[PDB]
């Protein structure tokens, strides 16, 4: 049975800001930009609807050296770091960008017809773009977020998969890394293993995956790190409609038409696929750049960032606006030469995070313990309890404590690092273990906070 | 029942070693002991339900004589009114 922090966690009535300086990021709208024979990035690829995850480094409560310490006994319980706080900052002008590719899979104007279409040669893709669906979102929680998406999952021993022929489909969960593609419009899969095609969508996502916050088996979560705290704006259309070029993969059941004749007599393409399109932003729409007070949550963890970490994941298309600029390569002819220029592309993006914590301190207990370790052992393995006097003990027994403390004082710093648990992933790191303060009259979010509060 | 402190336990081991031996004394938390104990205790207590059971069976310490073999292990009861003996007894001593 699992309960709310709340139960073995205790709140202090010390408060603590914190706040990134600035952040900020620029590269390629559509691909990184590296050397072509080697593969170190020169530049990389910077978009509005890239998933903006955030590694928040916190201090040691515990190790984190005070000014008054009475509140609390470090010889029965343990100090751990809650957020109640944060304000998420956009800084680039709201605006729109825009994808698309140059041989997307088009075959022909659905939407509106004159006469039958023509005859299927051979590559009739097309250069097209679009405005994906606006999305704004935002979660943090003390462990990192988990997305959904579709994917060719593992078949059965059977009829060995005749090439072409259609694969199976998994739904498949995984861990929402930093820049990774939120679903554009075109739904959340591994475009890369399940369109071989290689231009059924814009470049930017043509070799990627989009992912999806699988909302759902966050909250299943029983103790539920993942997030306590989220929000969620989509919403889009049909721009256009298409139909996809290529081979039937699936014949349509005769039993659902009339054979055609003369032009009609053969069937053209029934696959057909919408053009996305996040309509106009606005700023009564804007979603950041407000605070958040994480007071309650639904969840039974409480904004208990364990291990003093934190996980910021940010998603805006609202400012997704690429700006083209063009540098010529003589300062000469008094003629426009499409050879005089260059073409380039690019897109930034301003962030700015901020938040308030609230100290907390947790008497360890058996169960207390039991029930923690049991939730994620780590947590205390992480903690360290210096040996201490044992009570009324045999004074051979305490004797003997001594030795031990007293040669625990030998100087020697041989203590091994732990190792990044998920050095697997990879997103944005934000270190803040020197950024904490309590005069928050100093601050915007403290202020802001404070005063709301009142107390 | 018997409460087992120290003098006792001793006592009873100087007895016959056995009796306590054949006894098992579940780990328990520390009284107030160090959460480092504690602490320690749990973990070691945690690792103690691993479902693993390999208890060697103890040997029969007078395997070498031979007896007539009396198993009751399944034979207990409460309502001994349902027995002669119970209820003899139960009435002999009344209450």
């Known amino acids: ?184 419009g075109f739904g959340a899969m591994d475009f890369t293993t399940l369109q071989a095609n290689k231009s059924e969508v814009p470049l930017d996502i043509c070799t990627s995956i989009c992912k999806y916050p699988d909302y759902i088996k966050m909250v299943s979560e029983p103790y539920g790190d993942s997030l306590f705290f989220y929000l969620r704006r989509e919403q889009m259309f049909v721009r256009h409609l298409f139909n996809r070029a290529g081979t039937v993969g699936e014949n349509v059941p005769d039993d659902l038409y009339i054979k055609g004749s003369g032009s009609t007599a053969n ?69 426009y030469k499409n050879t005089n220029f260059k073409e380039y592309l690019r897109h930034g993006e301003e962030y700015d995070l901020q938040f308030i914590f609230q100290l907390c301190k947790i008497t360890l207990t058996a169960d207390v313990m039991t029930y923690i370790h049991s939730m994620n052992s780590t947590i205390l393995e992480d903690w360290n309890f210096g040996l201490q006097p044992p009570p009324g003990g045999t004074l051979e027994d305490t004797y003997r404590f001594v030795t031990s403390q007293a040669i625990a004082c030998q100087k020697h710093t041989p203590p091994a690092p732990k190792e990044d648990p998920l050095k697997k992933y990879t997103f944005w790191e934000v270190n803040l273990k020197e950024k904490f303060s309590a005069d928050l009259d100093q601050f915007p979010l403290g202020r802001k906070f404070l005063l709301q509060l009142g107390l």
């Open 267 to 335: 069937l053209a393409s029934s696959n057909y696929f919408p053009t996305p399109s996040g309509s106009m932003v606005t700023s009564d729409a804007q979603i950041f750049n407000k605070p958040y007070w994480l007071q309650r949550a639904q969840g039974h963890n409480n904004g208990i960032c364990w291990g003093n970490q934190l996980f910021v994941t940010v998603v805006d298309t609202t400012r997704s606006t690429n700006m083209s600029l063009c540098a010529a390569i003589s300062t000469s002819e008094t003629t």
């Open 1 to 184: 049975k699992v309960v709310s922090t709340d139960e073995y966690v205790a709140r202090t009535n010390i408060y603590y800001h914190a706040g990134t300086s600035r952040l900020l990021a620029v590269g390629h709208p559509y691909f990184p930009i590296k050397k072509p024979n080697n593969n170190k990035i020169l530049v990389p690829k910077v978009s509005g609807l890239q998933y903006r995850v955030f590694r928040i480094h916190l201090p040691d409560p515990n190790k984190f050296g005070f000014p008054d310490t009475s509140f609390y006994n470090p010889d029965t319980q343990r100090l751990v770091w809650a957020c109640v706080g944060v304000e998420v900052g956009r800084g680039q002008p709201l605006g729109v960008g825009i994808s698309g590719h140059p041989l997307l899979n088009k075959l022909d104007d659905t939407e509106n017809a004159s006469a039958y279409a023509a005859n299927a040669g051979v590559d009739n893709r097309e250069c097209i773009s679009m405005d994906y669906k606006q999305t704004q979102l935002c979660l943090i929680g003390c462990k990192p977020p988990i997305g959904e998406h579709w994917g060719k999952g593992s078949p059965c021993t059977q009829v060995a998969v005749q090439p072409g022929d259609c694969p199976p489909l998994e739904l498949i969960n995984t861990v929402i890394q930093d820049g990774d593609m939120v679903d554009t």
